[PDB]
Amino acid sequence: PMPHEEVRDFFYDRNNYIHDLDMAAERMFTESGMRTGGLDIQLAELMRDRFGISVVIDDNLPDTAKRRYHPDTKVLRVAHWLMPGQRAFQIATQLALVGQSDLISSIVATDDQLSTEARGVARIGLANYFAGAFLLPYREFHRAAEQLRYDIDLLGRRFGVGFETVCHRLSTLQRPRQRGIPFIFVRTDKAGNISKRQSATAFHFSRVGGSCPLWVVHDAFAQPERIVRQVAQMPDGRSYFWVAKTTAADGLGYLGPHKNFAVGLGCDLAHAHKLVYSTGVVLDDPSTEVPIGAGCKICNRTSCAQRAFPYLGGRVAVDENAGSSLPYS
Amino acid sequence: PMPHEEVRDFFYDRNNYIHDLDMAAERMFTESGMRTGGLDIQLAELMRDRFGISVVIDDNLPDTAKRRYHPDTKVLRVAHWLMPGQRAFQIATQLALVGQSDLISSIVATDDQLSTEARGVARIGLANYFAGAFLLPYREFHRAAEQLRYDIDLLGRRFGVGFETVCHRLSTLQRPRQRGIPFIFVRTDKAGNISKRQSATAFHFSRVGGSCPLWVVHDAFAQPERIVRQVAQMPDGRSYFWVAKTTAADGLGYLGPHKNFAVGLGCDLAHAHKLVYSTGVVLDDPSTEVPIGAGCKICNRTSCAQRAFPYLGGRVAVDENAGSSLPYS
Amino acid sequence: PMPHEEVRDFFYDRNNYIHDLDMAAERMFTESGMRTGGLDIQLAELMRDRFGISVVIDDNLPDTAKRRYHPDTKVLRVAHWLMPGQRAFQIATQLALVGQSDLISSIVATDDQLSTEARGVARIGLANYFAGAFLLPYREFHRAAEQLRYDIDLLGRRFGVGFETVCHRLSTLQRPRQRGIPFIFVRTDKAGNISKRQSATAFHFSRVGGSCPLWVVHDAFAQPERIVRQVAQMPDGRSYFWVAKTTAADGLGYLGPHKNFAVGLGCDLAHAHKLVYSTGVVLDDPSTEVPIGAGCKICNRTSCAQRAFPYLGGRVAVDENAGSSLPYS
Amino acid sequence: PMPHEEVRDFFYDRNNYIHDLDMAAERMFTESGMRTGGLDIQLAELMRDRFGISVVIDDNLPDTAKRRYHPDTKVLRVAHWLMPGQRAFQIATQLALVGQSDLISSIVATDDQLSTEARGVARIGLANYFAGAFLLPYREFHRAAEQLRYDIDLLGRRFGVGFETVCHRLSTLQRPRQRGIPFIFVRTDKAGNISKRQSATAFHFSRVGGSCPLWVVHDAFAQPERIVRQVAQMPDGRSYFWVAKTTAADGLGYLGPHKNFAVGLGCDLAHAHKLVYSTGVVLDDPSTEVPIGAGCKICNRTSCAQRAFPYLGGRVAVDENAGSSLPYS
Ligand SMILES: CC(C)(COP(=O)(O)OP(=O)(O)OC[C@H]1O[C@@H](n2cnc3c(N)ncnc32)[C@H](O)[C@@H]1OP(=O)(O)O)[C@@H](O)C(=O)NCCC(=O)NCCSC(=O)CCC(=O)O
Ligand SMILES: CC(C)(COP(=O)(O)OP(=O)(O)OC[C@H]1O[C@@H](n2cnc3c(N)ncnc32)[C@H](O)[C@@H]1OP(=O)(O)O)[C@@H](O)C(=O)NCCC(=O)NCCSC(=O)CCC(=O)O
Ligand SMILES: CC(C)(COP(=O)(O)OP(=O)(O)OC[C@H]1O[C@@H](n2cnc3c(N)ncnc32)[C@H](O)[C@@H]1OP(=O)(O)O)[C@@H](O)C(=O)NCCC(=O)NCCSC(=O)CCC(=O)O
Ligand SMILES: CC(C)(COP(=O)(O)OP(=O)(O)OC[C@H]1O[C@@H](n2cnc3c(N)ncnc32)[C@H](O)[C@@H]1OP(=O)(O)O)[C@@H](O)C(=O)NCCC(=O)NCCSC(=O)CCC(=O)O
Ligand code: SF4
Ligand code: SF4
Ligand code: SF4
Ligand code: SF4
């Protein structure tokens, strides 16, 4: 149980919603006079007025540094190559770590099983959560999500942030009397590594699994920078709607290392009709659903032409007198 | 240690070359009067003349059946939708299982640690090996590979078989005093599941690992049916040349299940200059080599922007006053 | 009016159906005892028995030659690297040119506007038509198309031929009392060059136009080797269903020149419900239809964000005080 | 000769460099105290101080409006969804049109063959040129291009602008005694429509042509957001180096209309060694050069497997006794 997995569980156990921290972010947004649009500058003004922290734009930082905070002189340097939404995210992260320290500490104190390292990692996680809840204040963002029928591009345009940030925030809308579609958010790379798992409730991939090549999230790299959608059926009959898309980090140069990821958002099929991404698709036809699994070794399907491995709790039929398109019959 | 892994190791231990069986395949090829070009027809005639086995092309077989052998009437039914190279492969598989039974049994008897099921899986594996060594007789195939500078498409065209079959056979050219480029052959899917591992000698991915998203094999699906090439450097400094390409199964219909795989062939950089795939590429410039790993949890690189997980034997450094492009620095 | 365009018109004027030639191909198929499956061998037998023509498989031909017929000794050589469907196509083409010469001549004689070169080009075109009508005899192919709901992959599997050949034959099903879906067939390359136009009746792209980047046929290369589908609306309100897919020629080698094409098949929206490719799509929602054009200079749309050129018969609004996402407002 | 072509030629005749206007942009940049990094803010302040123009960021503008200028109250509204580089570009466009009116008029007066509409289009073109020359002052941009070895991503990162803007400016570095690599810049879509042509000197595609599917610019869409590179040889023996990449407009929503374009930059092969994009590529091997053309009807190659149409000044050779891989041999 490594610390990043420990924090994964910390968030999964709390339905991916932190009521104290989300309320605090929204309260501060409103009390400060914030207005959506160009939050980076207003957050600079807020750090100055409320914390004596001076926010500067630094093209002198090392290439890989997004921000650096000097607590001795209270100076926050932010990378020039970050877009305004990204600058705002960095500034609000530091704002959480400086001005919401005690709240974060008390939230961490509620899971006493946490490893020594897991507590620091959770501090950073709650700081990122605060930044998301501030850039995307709960009520305004929820109403915008409903009005826009969950169009992630349009939400990003309205709030001045990227795709991954929007999907993050969508998977946290579990406030008691104002809930959005319950989502599972995942992040993957070209090799099937799932870097991030967040979920409003229990989904198949909340903690483990997801190495099924028929799952559309892995097809996002085959269709780069375009939204892919799938009506999927798990081996147990439960049906889900999946949207996914690639995200690439600009800059770095032709030679340099590049960041390529795929962000995917899934929900119960019953909710799909509320998404713009359901437009043009029939949702009431179980014949049109794509049968996927969780990874071949833990998948009990018997007629899958794509099986890479045999099912673990399964009987290996070996026939010298037959050959089929169905590996590991 | 599941049986398919036991057979993976069985072949790995023999440098992916089976001298008795390969010599037997070539002996039978030449003694029977075989000539490359239309092996399917000649193999049918051979089964008749030498084993009393009647080969029919049966469009009445189930959709997913490639072949079926009835030993009571010695009837081999072969799917009509298989190309001639594929039909030849099926017929030669049955030829190995019927006319080379004892040789295969004695070869299996040499790895006595094999589980009961692993022996059956090994019989199927050795029959496939024999089919490959028969359709592609060793000396003729080796001379053609050198003449064609390892152009896999041109080899397939010359011998009437597909990409995966050619790569299979290329990774087996370890006959003493007539060796080809030592290769590692792998097969993967969109989810990074590595279905096949065969290797002439010790490579990093001969048995485990290979979930590095910077590795070109996983970039094959973004460029389907197009050959991708990479000069890669493992974290230990050793450099390799990798060629890869996707392979899709035709038919099945728009709705039906589809087979999508990616086949990759790797060798030491020192051999790359003998490949047609090196044309246009500089091989002597360590600056141009792509730093890849074997999977993030077992990768010790320190400045990778693509890290999905932290390195296992390392402490997760967490800094509240900085944010970087380098996850898990 | 160049000769290939002249033959384009020759076929367009005849509703892409040649009743005499199609009936002759089917009549000969049936009288000869032909059975679907492995037509290449049976056509060899037919050339021998009926025309004294000897069909041989020649790996000695130049790389680019699919067949060569020596009339002095009546010998037809066919390339070894052609699949059986392709071999059958070559053999039946020569069969049309040798055994249906007078019929072809009389069909050509019906369009007396033909240029000197256009008559020879039309001879080859009618020979290809005969080959298609023979490999795919009309009644059997029509019934298979209806039973399979026009699944091009499954039709290819059943009849042992490729995607482009199937789409060719589908666009010719205009026999008076046994018509299939009326189609427009097109072939394009990565640069928008439309090499082939065939159509059962008058469609927008039967003769000219088709340089609209929003048209899905040009998106086939972005999604290689996978079927793409679109519900499109022309500027005049008429709605069409478009299926398209790439096709690549095997062999040639890593260095050599490659053939990449996209084949597209379109029909009136009203017919889409009879296609398997309509599965999962709502067809009764004009809101979900993609507005395309015929090429920007002849497209009268006013709010297209993708306009590359202004509409020819249009008023150029030029405003120094505004900038928009809509080029050439 | 439509007006947009007239302006294309207007710029082509001046080697895509406007000395007075470029010097004016740089003069104003330096005299005003401008420093690269946050030009949007400084340009707003400059419009205030120097022209009494009040710049507001207006989230109330219509969805498709990038800017709108009200001269009666001297109010410049700029779209909230534009990144800072884009906002700076809009503001500098208006700055050219308001504060450089007479210079632009006198520059337009030098091509007196211009149609009435061509003069307005040329005014917009010269304003865009000025905006490019201001956001990217000539000397600083030239020094940065050489230092960065023409890495377009790194230039964009350094100056806070996108790919298309950098390529625009790179193709204008023809100031006497301080020249950059002479470039041809083109913009195309999925249908091969070439929306933009700018060129430092005489290139094949400076005015017409470019519909060759083997040309790498059209392969950009198959690999979106990834840089593609090609060493190409025209039929006349002259060899060029081509870099290309797609550019997509964010937002707009899943349903809405999308802008997809491909931008390409070409130079003589002799200059390629100065590009970062040449790293790993051999430049002195004529065997490895890809033979491309300018469009099949104006391409005289004789063994091209990709020909879509026959060569215009040639007779279509038709052989009834042969079939080949070479259409229109
Ligand atoms: C996972 C890592 C370590 C990786 O960091 P990266 O360098 O890849 O990127 P990043 O810093 O997360 O930022 C990437 C994008 O995500 C956005 N973003 C990040 N966290 C967000 C949040 N909580 N809410 C909203 N948006 C958020 C940022 O704005 C940014 O957008 P832009 O790019 O547009 O600017 C980090 O995210 C992190 O430390 N998170 C907090 C700790 C945590 O939650 N760990 C559990 C992860 S779950 C896990 O690891 C389990 C997986 C498993 O099963 O093994
Ligand atoms: C792996 C399976 C079980 C599944 O195979 P599939 O049904 O998906 O396909 P396939 O039968 O292998 O056929 C696909 C193509 O491979 C070709 N092919 C297959 N074996 C070949 C060989 N030995 N030599 C040459 N070509 C060969 C066939 O001609 C065919 O070509 P066409 O496509 O053109 O028709 C099978 O291949 C098999 O039983 N192999 C023998 C058992 C074995 O060796 N297992 C160890 C694998 S190593 C492993 O799985 C462990 C790896 C790990 O644990 O990480
Ligand atoms: C167009 C050319 C010149 C190009 O030949 P290519 O080398 O590109 O390929 P090809 O010989 O046509 O064969 C390619 C595939 O098409 C199939 N195929 C070809 N003709 C067929 C037909 N009539 N019916 C069924 N299938 C057919 C072959 O089986 C083959 O399948 P496999 O690959 O799987 O084996 C040729 O097709 C031709 O000469 N056709 C006859 C003359 C004609 O009709 N000209 C008008 C074309 S329309 C036009 O040019 C107008 C465009 C415009 O607007 O300017
Ligand atoms: C071509 C049009 C009409 C259409 O343009 P669009 O609306 O599609 O986009 P856009 O306005 O050009 O802006 C897209 C990106 O290009 C950048 N950009 C535009 N002009 C630039 C310049 N001169 N220097 C540097 N960057 C420039 C913008 O910053 C912007 O960056 P971001 O995307 O990051 O925001 C327009 O560009 C224009 O009016 N140009 C001036 C008229 C002109 O020169 N016409 C001749 C073109 S030659 C032609 O069309 C004929 C070719 C032929 O006939 O074959
Ligand atoms: S066996 Fe299960 S997990 Fe594996 S590919 Fe098939 S459906 Fe997916
Ligand atoms: S950390 Fe290692 S395994 Fe992971 S992406 Fe980077 S190089 Fe590959
Ligand atoms: S203007 Fe017409 S032809 Fe051009 S992209 Fe738009 S819809 Fe297509
Ligand atoms: S004929 Fe010329 S223009 Fe056409 S694809 Fe070949 S090289 Fe390109």
Residue numbers in the entry:
A (entry chain A), B (entry chain B), C (entry chain A), D (entry chain B): 152 to 480
What did the study's authors say about this model?
Upregulation of the methylcitrate cycle (MCC) is required to assimilate and detoxify propionyl-CoA, a cholesterol degradation product. We show that MtPrpR has a novel overall structure and directly binds to CoA or short-chain acyl-CoA derivatives to form a homotetramer that covers the binding cavity and locks CoA tightly inside the protein. The regulation of this process involves a [4Fe4S] cluster located close to the CoA-binding cavity on a neighboring chain.
MtPrpR81–486_F155H remained a tetramer in solution as shown by SEC and crystallized in the same condition as the wild-type protein. The overall structure of the polypeptide chain superimposed perfectly to the CoA-bound wild-type protein, including the helix α1 where residue 155 is located (Cα_RMSD = 0.314 Å). This indicated that a fatty acyl-CoA derivative was bound by the mutant protein. The ligand was extracted and identified using LC-HRMS and a major [M+H]+ peak with an m/z of 868.12 was detected in addition to CoA. The amount of CoA was less than a quarter of the new compound according to the UV chromatogram (data not shown). This mass corresponds to both epimers of methylmalonyl-CoA as well as succinyl-CoA, which share an identical chemical formula. Since the MtPrpR81–486_F155H mutant was generated to make the ligand-binding residues identical to those of MtRamB, the observation of succinyl-CoA bound by this mutant indicates that succinyl-CoA is likely also bound by MtRamB.
